[model samples]
Target: MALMTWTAAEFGTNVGFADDQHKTIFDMVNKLHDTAATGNRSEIGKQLDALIDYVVMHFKSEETEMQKKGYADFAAHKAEHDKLVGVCADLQKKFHAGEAEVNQDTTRFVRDWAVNHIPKVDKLYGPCLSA
Candidate 1:
């Protein structure tokens, strides 16, 4: 998968789209803790599907906002989104085929993306909008 080139700690500010998406991942963020506490992979696959769906939806909405705002950096923003989409699609296919399982790495992929991409890249549109 396309992992973050930079670290998640760098993302310090979150905006509307980014913050909303990040909140959705709260469950996945604690997924490891939950699994460790209860060993409940049986139900998590469905939740994983839900989380992945939200990720794509949130990305789409954010991209649309960038496009509407005439953000010059839209292409670069979209490329990042495309990479995340590819990873999510691959995982979805694997799930449908019964060839894989949802793991913490999947959640981390999400957590890192939400924690990093949002505040860093996505927040660019925020202050621009408030102006």
Candidate 2:
């Protein structure tokens, strides 16, 4: 089963670029989930790397926009990004080192974060950026 579905009603931020990027992120997450289920170790590693790389890029874009607009919660928002990235990087390291695997739990962790963050945290920036 797919881990997430991107719905404008549920995930839209009203920030065009962020919403587009987020949709792409959702696709990547679902793709990763599929790959983890059927792909070999090498393929799973590649997919995981791709997802993490895209996430890092998206987060950087968001941070840049937040900083440019002087979003008051920038620091807190960035802290959240940094923490997720750190955890992802660590997982990437362990996965590549044969100490970890991208299983359902891993996908669920990311799905839960996105499901929560997009509506809760990213929505706060919609008004701020669209203004």
Candidate 3:
């Protein structure tokens, strides 16, 4: 089952690049959540890796745009991305090492981070990134 269904009306910013990336991130999270139930450790691990990979790529893409525009909140915006990076790294380590069982909290936190952070933090940079 998907953790959440995505709706652009609620999540979208008028800014195109950011909105597209946001939607991609939401899709990745939903895919990961859905894969969580197969009890297929390999599949879950691969999905988690893909999710982290996309998140990192998206952050870099946005950060490059922010820097080009000299957006004032670049550092703060990056800090928010870094927070998710840390979370993903921790989750990855636990998962790969077989040190811990993956739970709904892991997938839910990933979903919640995007759901909660985009409007609050990312949209602030939308105009800057959009141009």
Candidate 4:
């Protein structure tokens, strides 16, 4: 099931800004899910591109916060972010060459990554860590 069953409450992390960002990211992830499942392979590249861009920006924002707060695990978290960047780039390259397609499997990976990675990995940069 590639469907992303998400509600804002479940995405709550006591951070208003992060929650808002998560809402947008969640919507894109859902779009990817529907796009892949329906086989509307056209323009999906844009959606993926946007999602990846936003994710990168999100990481940078978090990294900035982490650095200011001196989060103990910042290095590890950043390494994880770098890994995802690489994966996203690979996906993009594959899409550009038309050698790869975004399907349920792709969306599933993003979905799993979105929900699991955000709350757990991103929260450490929140006010708790900064203050």
* Cα-based TM-score, every candidate: 0.74, 0.96, 0.90, 0.85
Q: What is the lDDT of residue 86 in candidate 2?
A: 95
Model 4, runs deviating above 4 Å: 5-9, 127-130
Clashing pairs in 4: none
- The residue pairs that clash in candidate 2, if any, are none
Instruction: Give me candidate 1's TM-score against the actual structure.
Output: 0.74
What is the per-residue lDDT of model 4 for residues 1-131, given as tens digits with 9 covering 90 to 100?
A: 42666565556666666667777777888887777767566768778888899988978877787777788889999999899899999999998899898887997887888778766887656666536
Q: Which parts of model 3 are misplaced by more than 4 Å?
A: none
TM-score, candidate number 4 = 0.85
Model 2 backbone overlap count:
0
RMSD for all candidates, in order, please: 5.1, 1.0, 1.6, 2.3
lDDT of 2: 0.91
Q: Name the regions of candidate 2 deviating beyond 4 angstroms.
A: none
lDDT of 1: 0.66
- For candidate 3, the C-alpha RMSD (Å) to the true structure equals 1.6
lDDT (10s digit) by residue, model 2, range 60-129 = 9999999999999999999999999999999988998999888767888999999999998999999889
lDDT of 3 at 85: 91
Candidate 1 lDDT over 23-118, as tens digits, reads 555654564335523447556666667767777787787778778888778889899989988988898788778797666666666777666676
- What's the lDDT for all of these models? 0.66, 0.91, 0.79, 0.78
Index of the highest-lDDT prediction? 2
Ranking by lDDT: 2, 3, 4, 1
